[PDB]
Write a protein that binds this ligand. Structure first.
Ligand SMILES: *[C@@H]1O[C@H](CO[C@@H]2O[C@@H](C)[C@@H](O)[C@@H](O)[C@@H]2O)[C@@H](O[C@@H]2O[C@H](CO)[C@@H](O[C@@H]3O[C@H](CO[C@H]4O[C@H](CO)[C@@H](O)[C@H](O)[C@@H]4O[C@@H]4O[C@H](CO)[C@@H](O)[C@H](O)[C@H]4NC(C)=O)[C@@H](O)[C@H](O[C@H]4O[C@H](CO)[C@@H](O)[C@H](O)[C@@H]4O[C@@H]4O[C@H](CO)[C@@H](O)[C@H](O)[C@H]4NC(C)=O)[C@@H]3O)[C@H](O)[C@H]2NC(C)=O)[C@H](O)[C@H]1NC(C)=O
Ligand SMILES: *[C@@H]1O[C@H](CO[C@@H]2O[C@@H](C)[C@@H](O)[C@@H](O)[C@@H]2O)[C@@H](O[C@@H]2O[C@H](CO)[C@@H](O[C@@H]3O[C@H](CO[C@H]4O[C@H](CO)[C@@H](O)[C@H](O)[C@@H]4O[C@@H]4O[C@H](CO)[C@@H](O)[C@H](O)[C@H]4NC(C)=O)[C@@H](O)[C@H](O[C@H]4O[C@H](CO)[C@@H](O)[C@H](O)[C@@H]4O[C@@H]4O[C@H](CO)[C@@H](O)[C@H](O)[C@H]4NC(C)=O)[C@@H]3O)[C@H](O)[C@H]2NC(C)=O)[C@H](O)[C@H]1NC(C)=O
Lengths: 209, 208
């Protein structure tokens, strides 16, 4: 047999906001009962760190255990492409497993944000679609949000990023609103957060006029 | 050990009786040590034998790639019959089994809306023509663009997204030169779905 190790990147919104906390997560599955206490070693560009909180064994229904270690990272380091390494080993055993992760390499490209009002044919329905097109960005790590008059909006869905011909990404975010709120003149805003934007943030408004 | 993958027929093939839909079972990572691979097809439990098998293929990583294709009936797929692929090989200690069928559920008609480019995009050399297709089920769908009867090629489509009402939506973006849009050419977004009358609909989009 043998345990498996998976490494997960922080959330884009966490890396692009100084006030939030980005976390790299290392997950070990298929740990047997009589396996020694799993130990973790974290490395940032080869340099070992020690500010990683490790969680206890979590029994799964397939009679294996699950162990999770979480490392807090600096926004500056992750956005500069530093390499994070998770070294998993049992206490005593010489076998060791390593996994690494880092940001996508490549030239960051600034996204272009366009807002599209609902089609004239959709006005007959009870609810209209507000469309936010975000194209031409790299890497694909991005966060899109909707809001109106300050408060966040709730009923929106965002497509996965699609790789475009020029090597950049684009996606669409669709906010569904009641037609009444669109005709009453309310202002809706599409917030985009990407590392290639000024202050990692831009915003485009959309209202009936 | 090797791995097996099972693919559904193309949505365009299942929505036109003039075309032929086929389920595709692909066996990859077969080692040259053992080239013998056996297929067994089942349609709602009943085994069939009318499926063909493409001969082996080389790979840049010193592996093989054998394919088996079963032709299905349009009514059989749209009714939800399960299709099973049982791959037997010496490289597999027990035969791998893969099943597939159309998503069960009440079909829902797609709404298609064409959206012209944003005013802010007119400052670029190319503009974006957007086709919103929402409220459809199942996710099997085909979206194409054409201008003045001839098909367009420079478009990309997002994968279907599960909306909160249990239906799917997607966007298709046709990229055209700003000149062509400004000259008044008519572009059409074609959508093919089983819940549509004649399985086909198209919405146009022009400057005036
Ligand atoms: C015993 O059970 C455990 C627990 O499973 C749970 O319990 C059982 C009983 C069932 O009920 C399960 O349904 C239930 O989930 C089993 O543990 C599982 O083990 C498998 C592998 O054997 C793992 O699969 C991997 O999954 C990752 C993604 O995992 C995320 O998303 C899952 C849902 O989609 C979610 O369940 C996971 O917890 C995890 O969630 C993430 O968590 C972090 C932090 O917690 C969070 O920040 C994230 O937001 C969150 N994400 C989401 C979406 O929620 C998947 O990525 C792996 O695929 C990679 O590796 C494959 C090789 O193993 C490879 O084939 C793939 O192509 C892919 O390869 C990667 O590709 C990327 C490209 O993008 C590349 O960059 C990478 O380098 C490359 N890596 C490699 C190695 O190739 C993989 O599929 C399960 O996650 C894991 N579940 C849990 C809960 O831990 C255990 O296997 C069982 N044991 C036995 C013997 O049966
Ligand atoms: C050696 O090389 C070969 C060949 O690779 C080729 O050559 C090398 C030299 C490189 O240049 C490669 O870049 C090049 O591709 C390798 O064979 C590959 O093996 C991998 C697996 O390791 C396969 O990946 C899977 O791909 C499927 C989708 O496959 C289609 O799309 C591919 C492009 O995306 C395309 O290349 C394929 O040919 C195939 O195309 C289809 O062809 C049929 C034929 O008629 C056609 O009808 C279809 O229309 C057409 N489709 C398209 C889209 O074009 C992908 O879906 C798989 O992901 C699932 O499986 C993972 C592993 O199980 C799992 O971790 C994922 O999470 C995911 O899980 C699935 O998720 C869906 C939805 O979420 C769910 O419904 C499923 O149930 C679920 N399944 C499971 C099991 O969980 C997977 O990524 C490659 O396709 C395959 N390449 C070819 C050409 O077959 C070989 O691996 C190499 N070996 C070594 C040792 O290196």
């Amino acid at each position: 047999g043998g345990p498996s190790v998976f490494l997960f990147p922080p959330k884009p919104k966490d890396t692009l906001m100084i006030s939030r906390t980005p976390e790299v997560t290392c997950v070990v599955v298929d740990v047997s009962q009589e396996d020694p206490e799993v130990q973790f070693n974290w490395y940032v560009d080869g340099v070992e760190v020690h500010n990683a909180k490790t969680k206890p064994r979590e029994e799964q229904f397939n009679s294996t255990y699950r162990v999770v270690s979480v490392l807090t990272v600096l926004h500056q380091d992750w956005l500069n492409g530093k390499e994070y390494k998770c070294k998993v080993s049992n206490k005593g055993l010489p076998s060791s497993i390593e996994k690494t992760i880092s940001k996508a390499k490549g030239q960051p490209r600034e996204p272009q944000v366009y807002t599209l009002p609902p089609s004239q044919e959709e006005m007959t329905k009870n609810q209209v679609s507000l469309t936010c097109l975000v194209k031409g960005f790299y890497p694909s790590d991005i966060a899109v949000e909707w809001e109106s008059n300050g408060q966040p909006e709730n009923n929106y869905k965002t497509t996965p990023p699609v790789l475009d011909s020029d090597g950049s990404f684009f996606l669409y975010s669709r906010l569904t609103v009641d037609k009444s709120r669109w005709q009453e003149g309310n202002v809706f805003s599409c917030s985009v957060m990407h590392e290639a934007l000024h202050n990692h943030y831009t915003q485009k408004s959309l209202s009936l006029s």
